[PDB]
């Protein structure tokens, strides 16, 4: 499970926040996009897979699962695309909670950032650095290091 | 050592490619921007520091070193800004060589990507995954994991 990620799309200020969560650690990367198109999702996954060893992605919905451009990016990057259907129901609630938590952080920084995209990146930072005692950033690095060795 | 990054700005197709290199591993993150401004650099560093434990950045030039927006991002993210002056002179040539490498990769994929930004992300992927026998992606995870424990 060191290579497993989940896509998550949430909305705020009439914009779309696209999130990738590393399932085993809770570590995230996120971007603001105008709308959640196959093309945007494909580009986001290319960026993600160049940065971390992404083996499997649970896509966030059937449109992206279907998307020719998403399928092309996954092929290019060596990613196995899977559905993101919560056969374990506690999955959906974990996501919902993260979306709520991310929006909360965004609200707390919203003041220090002129643009939504800045506040989202501040939120990524705070989320990944939060000690819970290791942080998500520490967990993902330990998980993947153990996997290499 | 595990926390040290160098900024590097290179040009192609009339656009700017902004690179951050993890000095100890050769691992990189990169983006295409229309122009290298303080605001763009500041945003790039915010994103980088939310994703990896960035302690020190050797900035690529004195305009970004001076930039009040870059200084504000570095303050926000807990980054020590340093100059990028190569007291070790083999530094310039290492950068120069990576820029040449990156541009070569971009040329090799240039055909598979409509947009420069896609080709740059493909080049980041190929760079970070190349076995050298570990890859840069493997090196950065082991360096930082060793540092955590
Ligand atoms: C309403 C509160 C406004 C107080 N903050 C500021 O005046 C400046 N913000 C910063 O110094 N930083 C660290 C954040 C930041 C960094 C880079 C960027 C940004 C932002 C951003 O704020 O969204 O936008 C695009 O490139 C600022 C800088 C540039 C443009 C606008 C604002
Ligand atoms: C010159 C030969 C072009 C052959 N490739 C294609 O037709 C498509 N490319 C892909 O399937 N992928 C994986 C790459 C990609 C992914 C996502 C994106 C992209 C690109 C990109 O190509 O730049 O642009 C922004 O969002 C394509 C898709 C959408 C727009 C344009 C092209
Ligand atoms: Cl990788
Ligand atoms: Cl981190």
Coordinates of C-alpha atoms and ligand atoms in Angstrom, one line a residue:
Chain A
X1 CA 0.0 0.0 0.0
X2 CA 3.0 2.5 -0.2
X3 CA 1.9 3.2 -3.8
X4 CA -1.8 3.8 -3.3
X5 CA -3.5 7.2 -3.7
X6 CA -7.1 8.4 -3.7
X7 CA -8.3 11.3 -5.7
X8 CA -10.8 13.7 -4.0
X9 CA -12.6 16.7 -5.6
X10 CA -14.1 19.3 -3.3
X11 CA -15.6 22.8 -3.9
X12 CA -15.2 26.3 -2.4
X13 CA -15.7 29.9 -3.5
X14 CA -17.3 28.5 -6.7
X15 CA -13.9 26.9 -7.6
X16 CA -12.8 23.3 -7.6
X17 CA -10.0 21.9 -5.3
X18 CA -8.5 18.7 -6.6
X19 CA -6.8 16.6 -3.9
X20 CA -4.6 13.4 -4.0
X21 CA -4.4 11.6 -0.7
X22 CA -1.7 9.0 0.0
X23 CA -4.0 6.5 1.7
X24 CA -1.5 4.9 4.2
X25 CA -0.2 8.2 5.6
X26 CA -2.9 10.9 5.1
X27 CA -0.3 13.0 3.2
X28 CA -1.8 15.2 0.5
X29 CA -1.1 17.3 -2.6
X30 CA -3.8 19.7 -3.9
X31 CA -4.5 22.3 -6.6
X32 CA -7.2 24.8 -7.4
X33 CA -8.7 24.3 -11.0
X34 CA -11.6 26.2 -12.7
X35 CA -13.5 22.9 -13.3
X36 CA -12.8 19.1 -12.9
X37 CA -12.2 18.0 -16.5
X38 CA -10.3 14.9 -17.7
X39 CA -7.5 17.1 -18.9
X40 CA -7.0 18.9 -15.6
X41 CA -7.2 15.5 -13.7
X42 CA -4.7 13.9 -16.2
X43 CA -2.2 16.8 -15.8
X44 CA -2.5 16.7 -11.9
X45 CA -1.7 12.9 -11.9
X46 CA 1.3 13.4 -14.2
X47 CA 2.6 16.0 -11.7
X48 CA 1.9 13.7 -8.8
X49 CA 3.5 10.6 -10.3
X50 CA 6.7 12.5 -11.2
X51 CA 7.0 13.4 -7.5
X52 CA 6.0 10.2 -5.5
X53 CA 6.0 6.5 -6.6
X54 CA 2.3 6.3 -7.6
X55 CA 1.3 2.7 -8.4
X56 CA -2.4 2.8 -8.0
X57 CA -5.0 5.6 -8.1
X58 CA -8.5 5.3 -6.8
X59 CA -10.2 7.8 -9.1
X60 CA -12.8 10.1 -7.6
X61 CA -15.7 9.5 -10.0
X62 CA -16.7 7.7 -13.2
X63 CA -16.1 10.5 -15.6
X64 CA -12.4 10.7 -14.7
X65 CA -12.3 6.9 -14.6
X66 CA -13.6 6.9 -18.2
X67 CA -11.7 10.0 -19.5
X68 CA -9.4 9.1 -22.5
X69 CA -7.0 11.8 -21.3
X70 CA -6.9 10.4 -17.7
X71 CA -6.4 6.9 -19.1
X72 CA -3.5 8.3 -21.3
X73 CA -1.8 10.0 -18.4
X74 CA -2.1 6.8 -16.2
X75 CA -0.6 4.7 -19.1
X76 CA 2.2 7.2 -19.6
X77 CA 3.0 7.4 -15.8
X78 CA 2.7 3.6 -15.1
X79 CA -0.3 4.1 -12.9
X80 CA -3.1 1.5 -12.4
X81 CA -6.3 3.3 -12.5
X82 CA -9.0 1.8 -10.1
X83 CA -12.5 2.9 -9.1
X84 CA -12.7 4.7 -5.8
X85 CA -15.8 2.9 -4.6
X86 CA -15.8 2.5 -0.7
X87 CA -16.2 -1.2 -0.4
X88 CA -15.2 -0.2 3.1
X89 CA -17.7 2.5 3.9
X90 CA -15.4 4.2 6.5
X91 CA -13.5 5.5 3.4
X92 CA -16.2 8.1 2.3
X93 CA -16.4 9.5 5.9
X94 CA -12.6 9.8 6.2
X95 CA -12.6 11.8 2.9
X96 CA -15.5 14.0 4.0
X97 CA -13.7 14.7 7.3
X98 CA -10.5 15.7 5.4
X99 CA -12.5 18.0 3.1
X100 CA -14.1 19.6 6.2
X101 CA -10.7 19.9 7.9
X102 CA -9.0 21.4 4.7
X103 CA -11.8 24.0 4.4
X104 CA -11.4 24.9 8.1
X105 CA -7.6 25.5 7.5
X106 CA -8.3 27.4 4.4
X107 CA -10.7 29.6 6.4
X108 CA -8.0 30.2 9.1
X109 CA -5.4 31.3 6.5
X110 CA -7.9 32.8 4.1
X111 CA -6.9 36.2 5.5
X112 CA -3.2 35.9 4.8
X113 CA -3.7 34.9 1.2
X114 CA -5.1 37.1 -1.5
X115 CA -5.9 34.2 -3.8
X116 CA -7.7 30.9 -3.1
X117 CA -4.8 28.9 -4.7
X118 CA -2.3 30.3 -2.1
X119 CA -4.7 29.5 0.8
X120 CA -5.0 25.9 -0.5
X121 CA -1.2 25.5 -0.6
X122 CA -1.0 26.9 2.9
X123 CA -3.6 24.4 3.9
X124 CA -1.6 21.5 2.3
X125 CA 1.5 22.7 4.2
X126 CA -0.4 22.8 7.6
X127 CA -2.1 19.5 6.9
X128 CA 1.1 17.7 6.0
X129 CA 3.2 19.1 8.9
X130 CA 0.5 18.6 11.7
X131 CA 1.8 16.2 14.3
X132 CA -0.8 13.6 15.3
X133 CA 3.4 11.7 17.2
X134 CA 4.4 11.9 13.6
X135 CA 3.1 14.1 10.8
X136 CA 1.6 12.8 7.5
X137 CA 4.9 14.1 5.7
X138 CA 6.9 11.9 8.1
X139 CA 4.6 8.9 7.6
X140 CA 4.7 8.9 3.8
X141 CA 8.6 9.2 3.8
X142 CA 8.9 6.3 6.4
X143 CA 6.4 4.2 4.5
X144 CA 8.1 4.5 1.1
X145 CA 11.6 4.3 2.6
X146 CA 10.7 0.9 4.3
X147 CA 9.4 -0.2 0.9
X148 CA 12.6 0.7 -0.9
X149 CA 14.7 -1.2 1.8
Chain B
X1 CA 21.8 18.5 4.3
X2 CA 18.4 16.7 4.1
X3 CA 16.6 20.1 4.1
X4 CA 18.7 22.0 1.5
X5 CA 17.2 22.9 -1.9
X6 CA 18.5 25.1 -4.8
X7 CA 16.3 27.2 -7.1
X8 CA 17.2 27.2 -10.8
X9 CA 15.5 29.1 -13.5
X10 CA 16.0 28.1 -17.2
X11 CA 14.3 29.2 -20.5
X12 CA 12.7 27.4 -23.4
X13 CA 10.2 28.2 -26.2
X14 CA 10.2 31.8 -24.9
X15 CA 8.8 30.6 -21.5
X16 CA 10.4 30.2 -18.1
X17 CA 11.0 26.9 -16.3
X18 CA 11.4 27.2 -12.6
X19 CA 13.2 24.3 -10.9
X20 CA 13.8 23.3 -7.3
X21 CA 16.6 20.7 -6.8
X22 CA 17.1 18.8 -3.6
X23 CA 20.9 19.2 -3.5
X24 CA 21.8 15.9 -1.7
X25 CA 19.7 13.6 -4.0
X26 CA 19.3 15.4 -7.4
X27 CA 15.5 15.1 -7.0
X28 CA 13.5 18.0 -8.6
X29 CA 10.2 19.7 -8.8
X30 CA 9.5 22.2 -11.7
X31 CA 6.9 24.4 -13.2
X32 CA 6.5 26.5 -16.3
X33 CA 5.7 30.3 -15.6
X34 CA 5.3 33.2 -18.1
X35 CA 8.1 35.1 -16.3
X36 CA 10.2 34.8 -13.2
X37 CA 8.6 37.3 -10.7
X38 CA 8.9 37.4 -6.9
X39 CA 5.2 36.3 -6.7
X40 CA 5.6 33.3 -8.9
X41 CA 8.8 32.2 -7.1
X42 CA 7.1 32.8 -3.7
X43 CA 4.1 30.6 -4.7
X44 CA 6.4 27.9 -6.1
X45 CA 8.3 27.8 -2.7
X46 CA 5.1 27.6 -0.7
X47 CA 4.0 24.6 -2.8
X48 CA 7.4 22.9 -2.4
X49 CA 7.6 23.4 1.4
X50 CA 4.1 21.9 1.9
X51 CA 5.3 18.8 0.1
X52 CA 8.9 18.2 1.4
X53 CA 10.7 19.4 4.6
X54 CA 12.4 22.5 3.1
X55 CA 14.8 24.0 5.7
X56 CA 17.1 26.1 3.5
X57 CA 16.7 27.5 -0.1
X58 CA 19.6 28.7 -2.1
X59 CA 17.8 31.3 -4.2
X60 CA 18.6 31.5 -7.9
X61 CA 19.3 35.3 -8.2
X62 CA 19.4 38.5 -6.2
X63 CA 16.0 39.7 -7.3
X64 CA 14.3 36.7 -5.7
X65 CA 16.7 36.9 -2.7
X66 CA 15.5 40.6 -2.3
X67 CA 11.8 40.1 -3.2
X68 CA 9.5 41.0 -0.3
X69 CA 7.0 38.4 -1.5
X70 CA 9.7 35.7 -1.6
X71 CA 10.8 36.8 1.9
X72 CA 7.2 36.6 3.1
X73 CA 6.7 33.1 1.7
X74 CA 10.0 31.9 3.2
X75 CA 9.0 33.4 6.6
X76 CA 5.5 31.8 6.3
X77 CA 6.9 28.3 5.4
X78 CA 9.9 28.3 7.9
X79 CA 12.5 28.5 5.2
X80 CA 15.9 30.1 5.6
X81 CA 16.6 31.9 2.5
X82 CA 20.3 31.9 1.5
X83 CA 22.1 33.2 -1.6
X84 CA 22.9 30.6 -4.3
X85 CA 26.5 31.8 -4.8
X86 CA 28.6 28.8 -5.8
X87 CA 31.6 29.0 -3.3
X88 CA 32.1 25.5 -4.7
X89 CA 32.5 26.4 -8.4
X90 CA 31.4 22.9 -9.6
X91 CA 27.9 23.9 -8.5
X92 CA 27.3 26.1 -11.6
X93 CA 28.2 23.3 -13.9
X94 CA 26.1 20.7 -12.1
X95 CA 23.1 23.1 -12.6
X96 CA 24.1 23.9 -16.2
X97 CA 24.3 20.1 -16.9
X98 CA 20.8 19.4 -15.4
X99 CA 19.3 22.3 -17.4
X100 CA 20.8 20.7 -20.5
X101 CA 19.6 17.2 -19.4
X102 CA 16.1 18.5 -18.7
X103 CA 15.9 20.3 -22.1
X104 CA 17.0 17.1 -23.8
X105 CA 14.2 15.1 -22.0
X106 CA 11.7 17.8 -23.0
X107 CA 12.8 17.4 -26.6
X108 CA 12.4 13.6 -26.4
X109 CA 8.8 13.8 -25.1
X110 CA 8.1 17.1 -26.8
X111 CA 6.0 15.2 -29.4
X112 CA 3.7 13.4 -26.8
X113 CA 2.7 16.7 -25.2
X114 CA 0.7 19.5 -26.8
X115 CA 1.8 22.0 -24.2
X116 CA 5.2 22.8 -22.8
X117 CA 4.0 22.4 -19.2
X118 CA 3.0 18.8 -19.8
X119 CA 6.4 18.0 -21.4
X120 CA 8.1 19.7 -18.4
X121 CA 6.2 17.4 -16.0
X122 CA 7.1 14.4 -18.1
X123 CA 10.7 15.4 -17.9
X124 CA 10.4 15.8 -14.1
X125 CA 9.0 12.3 -14.0
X126 CA 11.8 10.8 -16.2
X127 CA 14.5 12.7 -14.2
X128 CA 13.3 11.5 -10.8
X129 CA 12.8 7.9 -11.8
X130 CA 16.1 7.4 -13.8
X131 CA 18.3 4.8 -12.1
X132 CA 21.8 6.1 -11.6
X133 CA 21.8 2.1 -8.6
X134 CA 19.0 4.2 -7.1
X135 CA 16.9 7.0 -8.6
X136 CA 16.8 10.6 -7.3
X137 CA 13.2 9.8 -6.0
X138 CA 14.7 6.9 -4.0
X139 CA 17.6 8.9 -2.7
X140 CA 15.5 11.8 -1.3
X141 CA 13.1 9.5 0.5
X142 CA 16.1 7.5 2.1
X143 CA 17.9 10.8 3.0
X144 CA 14.8 12.2 4.7
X145 CA 13.8 8.9 6.4
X146 CA 17.3 8.5 7.8
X147 CA 17.0 12.1 9.1
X148 CA 13.6 11.4 10.8
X149 CA 14.9 8.3 12.7
Ligands
LIG1 C1 -5.6 39.5 1.6 C2 -4.2 39.2 2.2 C3 -3.1 39.6 1.3 C4 -1.8 39.6 2.0 N1 -0.8 39.0 1.2 C5 -0.1 39.8 0.3 O1 -0.3 40.9 0.1 C6 0.9 39.0 -0.6 N2 0.9 37.6 -0.1 C7 2.2 37.1 0.3 O2 3.1 37.8 0.7 N3 2.2 35.7 0.2 C8 3.3 35.0 0.9 C9 1.2 34.9 -0.3 C10 1.2 34.9 -1.9 C11 2.4 34.6 -2.4 C12 2.6 34.5 -3.8 C13 1.5 34.8 -4.6 C14 0.3 35.1 -4.0 C15 0.1 35.2 -2.7 C16 -1.2 35.5 -2.1 O3 -1.3 36.3 -1.2 O4 -2.2 35.0 -2.7 O5 -0.6 35.3 -5.0 C17 0.1 35.0 -6.2 O6 1.5 34.8 -5.9 C18 0.6 39.1 -2.0 C19 1.7 38.9 -2.9 C20 1.4 39.0 -4.3 C21 0.2 39.1 -4.7 C22 -0.9 39.3 -3.9 C23 -0.7 39.2 -2.5
LIG2 C1 1.2 17.0 -29.8 C2 0.7 15.7 -29.5 C3 -0.4 15.7 -28.5 C4 -0.8 14.3 -28.1 N1 -1.5 14.2 -26.9 C5 -2.8 14.5 -26.8 O1 -3.6 14.7 -27.7 C6 -3.4 14.7 -25.4 N2 -2.3 14.4 -24.4 C7 -2.4 13.4 -23.5 O2 -3.2 12.5 -23.7 N3 -1.7 13.6 -22.3 C8 -1.5 12.5 -21.4 C9 -0.9 14.8 -22.1 C10 -1.7 15.9 -21.5 C11 -2.5 15.7 -20.4 C12 -3.3 16.6 -19.8 C13 -3.2 17.9 -20.3 C14 -2.4 18.2 -21.4 C15 -1.6 17.2 -22.1 C16 -0.8 17.6 -23.2 O3 -0.8 16.8 -24.2 O4 -0.2 18.7 -23.2 O5 -2.5 19.5 -21.8 C17 -3.2 20.0 -20.6 O6 -3.9 18.9 -19.9 C18 -4.0 16.0 -25.1 C19 -5.0 16.0 -24.2 C20 -5.6 17.2 -23.9 C21 -5.2 18.4 -24.5 C22 -4.2 18.3 -25.4 C23 -3.6 17.2 -25.7
LIG3 CL1 9.3 8.6 -8.0
LIG4 CL1 6.5 18.1 5.1

